[PDB]
Amino acid sequence: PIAFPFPDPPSVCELPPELAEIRDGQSVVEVKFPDGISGWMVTKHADVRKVLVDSRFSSKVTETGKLMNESLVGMDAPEHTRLRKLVTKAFTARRVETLRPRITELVGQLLDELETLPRPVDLVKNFSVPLPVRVICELLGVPAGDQDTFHAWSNALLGDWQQVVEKEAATVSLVNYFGELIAVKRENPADDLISELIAISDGDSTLTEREIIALSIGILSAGHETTANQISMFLVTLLHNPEELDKLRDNREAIPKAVDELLRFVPLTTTGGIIPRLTTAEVELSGGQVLPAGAVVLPAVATANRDPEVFEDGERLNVTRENNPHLAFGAGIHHCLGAQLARIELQEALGAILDRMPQVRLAVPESELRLKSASIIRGLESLPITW
């Protein structure tokens, strides 16, 4: 077995070279984690998708611990089926699409603030970290008067492992905050997700208040650090590929395809941020490998998203790519609930940056940039820019 996680490459713009070497040779390999558990990794686009779509792979694994047990992402059917069907009574494509104008305003506000800071200015702290929380607040219905405090909580959640106590205490505050917000929204409902969910809960469905709380925090948690890290990594990738970036410069029509190309090419982790699945029966894969029952299986999204069988010239960035069946939002029943909302946030963020800061560049050499050591997601410590 080879050791997983692989070494981090010198450059934030490279993936571990062992991924492509596996994908393109042995394909499915055994790995060994640092705690000595042994697993399997699959790398081809067909195997990764199978691992996410097939019924034989299970996701089932303090306030923090309870919430993890209550989150969609750790559930299997039938519990997962029920909860998702309850949440999507309110979390709809219509709700998300109709938020686009407010997302655009929130992006503009943050850029209005950014452009008055001393320069060069860190994009991470001053834009990428706060934007996904603003958007989540707007979706959920957290009022602006609660937002400074809500940011402080959210940001405490992103700590290290070195701060288990900070994070647990932030989680506790968020849990009591959302209980109070439910009573305010029951009395004065508004156009937001919590108001609708409460109305569903108060009607005849079995949706509970606690489930509303667990949904709210699960959305925060799924959608803050992911989106945050991707905004900054996307900008770096684009800058590293100036002929791709030029195709976008006065051409906001091209932004949606570019975002999907960036999602494909700039991964959250080796597995797209997806926790290894557990097989519940043996499973035959596209190449004839049969994964055994009871096995921990890593779906290598990052490399499947460059599989030369599905993506032409897949190890390079092409922001014009039309044919892009990427797995960055997963597939099957756990397919990212926020997939459309995330696309909208990244589209609006990137289109505005390029519109407003068309000469944006890095204020340090790209070799000086580095991924945070102590993060579960691939993300920059800082991103010093000027324009």
- Among K ion, ligand HEM, none, what binds residue 6 when CB lies within 5 to 8 Å by partner kind? K ion
Which of 227, 279 has the CB closer to ligand HEM? 227
Q: Which of residues 226-245 bind ligand HEM (CB under 6 A)?
A: 226-227, 230
Q: Are 345 and 135 in contact (CB under 8 A)?
A: yes
| 338 is a contact residue toward ligand HEM (CB under 6 A) | yes
Q: Which one of 123, 194, 304, 337 is in contact with ligand HEM (CB under 6 A)?
A: 337
Non-local (6+) Cβ contacts of 12 within 8 A are 233, 236, 366, 369, 370, 371, 380
Which of 19, 222 has the CB closer to ligand HEM? 222
Q: Tell me how far, at minimum, the Cβ of 269 lies from K ion, in Å.
A: 7
Taking phi over 0 as left and psi of -120 to 50 as alpha, with beta for the rest, 76 belongs to: beta
Q: Phi and psi (nearest 5°) for 258?
A: -65, -45
Q: Are 204 and 76 in contact (CB under 8 A)?
A: no
* H/E stretch holding 384: strand 384-386
- According to DSSP, the residues that pair with 278 across neighbouring strands are 58, 296
- Among K ion, ligand HEM, none, what binds residue 268 when CB lies within 5 to 8 Å by partner kind? ligand HEM
Which of 141, 330 has the CB closer to ligand HEM? 330
Residue 277 one-letter amino acid: R
- Residue 385's alpha-carbon distances to 205, 359, 366, in angstroms, are 50, 10, 11
Residues 321, 327: Cα–Cα separation, whole Å: 15
Q: Which one of 13, 53, 73, 199 is in contact with ligand HEM (CB under 6 A)?
A: 73
306 assigned binding-site residue? no
Which of 278, 337 has the CB closer to ligand HEM? 337
| 379 is a contact residue toward ligand HEM (CB under 6 A) | no
Non-local (6+) Cβ contacts of 180 within 8 A are none
CA-nearest of 345, 365, 373 to 134 is 345
Q: Tell me how far, at minimum, the Cβ of 263 lies from ligand HEM, in Å.
A: 6
| 219 is a contact residue toward ligand HEM (CB under 6 A) | yes
- Among K ion, ligand HEM, none, what binds residue 379 when CB lies within 5 to 8 Å by partner kind? none
Which of 197, 319 has the CB closer to K ion? 197
Binding residues for heme b: 80, 84, 277, 334, 336
Note the residues at the interface with ligand HEM (CB under 6 A): 52, 59, 72-73, 84, 218-219, 222-223, 226-227, 230, 268, 272-275, 328-330, 334, 336-338, 341-342
